[PDB]
Amino acid sequence: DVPVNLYRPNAPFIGKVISNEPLVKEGGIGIVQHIKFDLTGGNLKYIEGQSIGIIPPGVDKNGKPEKLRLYSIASTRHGDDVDDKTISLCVRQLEYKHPESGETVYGVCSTYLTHIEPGSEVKITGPVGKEMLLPDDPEANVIMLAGGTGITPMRTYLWRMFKDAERAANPEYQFKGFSWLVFGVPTTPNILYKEELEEIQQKYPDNFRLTYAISREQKNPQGGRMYIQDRVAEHADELWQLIKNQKTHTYICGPRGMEEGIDAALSAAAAKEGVTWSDYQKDLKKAGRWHVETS
Numbered sequence: 001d002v003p004v005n006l007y008r009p010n011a012p013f014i015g016k017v018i019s020n021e022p023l024v025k026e027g028g029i030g031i032v033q034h035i036k037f038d039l040t041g042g043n044l045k046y047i048e049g050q051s052i053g054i055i056p057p058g059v060d061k062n063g064k065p066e067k068l069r070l071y072s073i074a075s076t077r078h079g080d081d082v083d084d085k086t087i088s089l090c091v092r093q094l095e096y097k098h099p100e101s102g103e104t105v106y107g108v109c110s111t112y113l114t115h116i117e118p119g120s121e122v123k124i125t126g127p128v129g130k131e132m133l134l135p136d137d138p139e140a141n142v143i144m145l146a147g148g149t150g151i152t153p154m155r156t157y158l159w160r161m162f163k164d165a166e167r168a169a170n171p172e173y174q175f176k177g178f179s180w181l182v183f184g185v186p187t188t189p190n191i192l193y194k195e196e197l198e199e200i201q202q203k204y205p206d207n208f209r210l211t212y213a214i215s216r217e218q219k220n221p222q223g224g225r226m227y228i229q230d231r232v233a234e235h236a237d238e239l240w241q242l243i244k245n246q247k248t249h250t251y252i253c254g255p256r257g258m259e260e261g262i263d264a265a266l267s268a269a270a271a272k273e274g275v276t277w278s279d280y281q282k283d284l285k286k287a288g289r290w291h292v293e294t295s
């Protein structure tokens with residue numbers, strides 16, 4: 001049923017880049033690109049919440065061929081043009097500084113991807129993943145907690161739920177539940193897909209709530225910069241109330257370490273009603289309603 005490993009690294013699908021467009025607006029920090037690939041000529045199918053592998057060219061410092069890196073699929077199963085012909089990724093160029101070994105260091109696969117030109121051939125594997133799947137139930141509530149390119153699987157959910165062309169293509173999934181995205185980025189220019197997220201909220205104000213945590217522009221009640229964990233604490237009681245519904249699913253995606261502050265906030269909320277969140281959470285994970293994908 002769920003497609004998985006239609007292509008493997010020993011014999012990857014050779015897709016072609018259609019487009020590579022910037023998602024960070026001027027005045028933003030770093031580079032994050034929306035890259036769409038042509039899947040025609042192969043049989044790669046996928047669903048929302050999954051990832052694919054990309055194998056970059058070249059060898060590592062020991063002369064060994066580079067291995068795949070996994071990237072969350074940014075598009076629904078139908079692709080951005082709703083034609084079942086493409087797949088998209090949302091890729092941040094990894095950059096960081098050493099203890100002054102050279103200067104700035106640039107990630108191999110992400111630099112390759114963010115600078116890739118239309119027409120180029122790319123080695124793709126997958127899809128992979130069954131832990132970030134969206135429920136078929138159109139009355140489900142969906143909480144989405146995303147930092148940075150943790151937005152990526154959330155885009156697949158929200159596009160499937162709310163894009164006109166998706167609704168026309170998916171007669172079986174006409175979303176009427178409530179979805180709430182809490183999205184943490186450093187600046188307004190860094191709000192990936194800002195325009196479309198805000199278009200969705202304006203069209204569906206009773207079915208989609210959009211909350212930002214913008215660290216360089218906002219401060220929490222303690223005076224520190226605003227992070228997603230702060231917004232979760234701010235809305236902890238409300239989020240807990242929603243989580244108690246048997247049909248509510250929560251999705252967490254982004255940097256490993258974002259989970260700690262989220263659990264602390266929800267633990268304080270749940271404790272007010274005599275519930276130990278860590279235990280309730282274990283039951284949710286077992287039931288397939290607590291979805292985490294961080295690294």
Ligand SMILES: Cc1cc2nc3c(=O)[nH]c(=O)nc-3n(C[C@H](O)[C@H](O)[C@H](O)COP(=O)(O)OP(=O)(O)OC[C@H]3O[C@@H](n4cnc5c(N)ncnc54)[C@H](O)[C@@H]3O)c2cc1C
Nearest residue numbers: 069070071072090091092094096107108109110149152295
């Ligand atoms: C399931 C999954 C989904 C993912 N989805 C996405 C996605 O949608 N978008 C996206 O942009 N990324 C995503 N990632 C991350 C992605 O897989 C790559 O790891 C990332 O793009 C960097 O790879 P790279 O080849 O550019 O860097 P590499 O050449 O592989 O370099 C990475 C290495 O650099 C070092 N390093 C990294 N940061 C620092 C630091 N600050 N200080 C010192 N050393 C450091 C570490 O040793 C690390 O192993 C995902 C990862 C997983 C596991």
